[PDB]
Design a protein around this ligand. Sequence first.
Ligand SMILES: O=C(O)/C(S)=C/c1c[nH]c2cc(Br)ccc12
Ligand SMILES: O=C(O)/C(S)=C/c1c[nH]c2cc(Br)ccc12
Ligand SMILES: [Ca+2]
Ligand SMILES: [Ca+2]
Ligand SMILES: [Ca+2]
Ligand SMILES: [Ca+2]
Ligand SMILES: [Ca+2]
Ligand SMILES: [Ca+2]
Ligand SMILES: [Ca+2]
Ligand SMILES: [Ca+2]
Lengths: 173, 173
Amino acid sequence: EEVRQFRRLFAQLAGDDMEVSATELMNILNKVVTRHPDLKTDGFGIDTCRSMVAVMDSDTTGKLGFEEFKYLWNNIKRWQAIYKQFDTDRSGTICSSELPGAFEAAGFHLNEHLYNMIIRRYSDESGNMDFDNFISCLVRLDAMFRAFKSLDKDGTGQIQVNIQEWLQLTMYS
Amino acid sequence: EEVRQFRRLFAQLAGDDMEVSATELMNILNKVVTRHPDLKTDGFGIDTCRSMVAVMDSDTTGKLGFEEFKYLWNNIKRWQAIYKQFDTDRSGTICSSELPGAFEAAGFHLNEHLYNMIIRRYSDESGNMDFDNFISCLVRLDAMFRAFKSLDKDGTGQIQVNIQEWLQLTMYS
Ligand SMILES: O=C(O)/C(S)=C/c1c[nH]c2cc(Br)ccc12
Ligand SMILES: O=C(O)/C(S)=C/c1c[nH]c2cc(Br)ccc12
Ligand SMILES: [Ca+2]
Ligand SMILES: [Ca+2]
Ligand SMILES: [Ca+2]
Ligand SMILES: [Ca+2]
Ligand SMILES: [Ca+2]
Ligand SMILES: [Ca+2]
Ligand SMILES: [Ca+2]
Ligand SMILES: [Ca+2]
C-alpha cells in the first residue's frame, strides 16, 4: 500500500490545482514536525518554503507536481533520520561538531571552508542549526549539486554559465 | 549632519559586536516599515533577513559592517522611493503590470522569462508584490549582478566555476 498511500497523500495535499504550493508544503511539514518532539524548530516559514518550491520546481509551473513532490518528500524522510541520528546529545539541534558527519551521511562531502559558510548562513550564534534550517540547507545543497551536474555535460568539473542562466538559477531559488 | 546621524544609527543598531546581524536588521526594518503605511507588508522575516545579510556580507564575517550596511541602507532608501512612485494605483503593492517600470527605474532590464520566474517567486497569486518581498528581490538581484561582474571582468557574459566555487556562490546567499 506504500504507492497507494502516497498518491493519496499527494492528492489531498495538492488539492484543486493538482500541485503543491509553498503554503501547502509549509503546512504539511509543520503538521508532521508536530509529532516529532526530538526535532527542535521554530517552524517552517513561508519564505523558506517558497525557496524550497522554487529549487525543486524544475518545470517552472510555480508549484510541485507529483514527481517533484515525491523527490522532495523522499529526501526529507531520509534527512530527518540523519538529523536524529547525528544529534548525538539530544539538543534537538545539529551543532558544528555534529554537522559534517550529518552532511556526509547524506552524501555531501564538503570541505571545512564550505562547512564554515553553511554554519554562518544556517546556524545560530552558538553554531546550532534547527531542523527547518537543516532541511532548507540540504534541499538547496542537493539542488545546487544537481544544477552543477546538469551543466557539466562533459564531466570536466568546470561549468560555463552565462548571465541569463546565472540570474535564472539564483533568482528562482 | 546626514553622515553624523547615520554613524549614530549604525552604532546603536550594531551594538556590542560592532556589526549588524540578521536579527538586528529584521528588527530595524520592521520598526521602520510600521511608520510607512503606504508600504504594505506582512513583516520582514528572519530567513529573509539572513539571506539579505549573506548577499551583502562581502567579507564573510557573517554580519554587516559599516560600509556593508551603508550600501544596503542607501539602496533600500532609493528602492522604497521607486516603490511609492511606481505603485500608480496607490494599492501599497506592486503588481505584475507595475513591476517592469519599477525595475527599469532601479536600472534592471530583464527578459519576460526572468520576470515570470521573479513573479512566481516573489509575488502573490494575483501577481502583486508587497514591500518586504520587493526589497528582498532587489537586494538579491543587485547582488547577483555584482557577483557575476566581479567574476567576469572582461564582459564575456560568461563565468567558469568549479564545484567549490559554485557552492560558495550559491549556498552563501
Ligand atoms: O520518524 C519517522 O518514521 C518518519 S517516516 C519521519 C518523517 C517522514 N517525513 C517527515 C517529515 C518531517 Br518535516 C519530519 C519527519 C518526517
Ligand atoms: O521616505 C523617506 O524619506 C525615507 S528616509 C525612507 C526610508 C529610508 N529607509 C527606509 C527603510 C524602510 Br524598511 C522604509 C523606508 C525607508
Ligand atoms: Ca494546490
Ligand atoms: Ca512544477
Ligand atoms: Ca545536537
Ligand atoms: Ca529555524
Ligand atoms: Ca550586533
Ligand atoms: Ca561583513
Ligand atoms: Ca500597485
Ligand atoms: Ca512579504
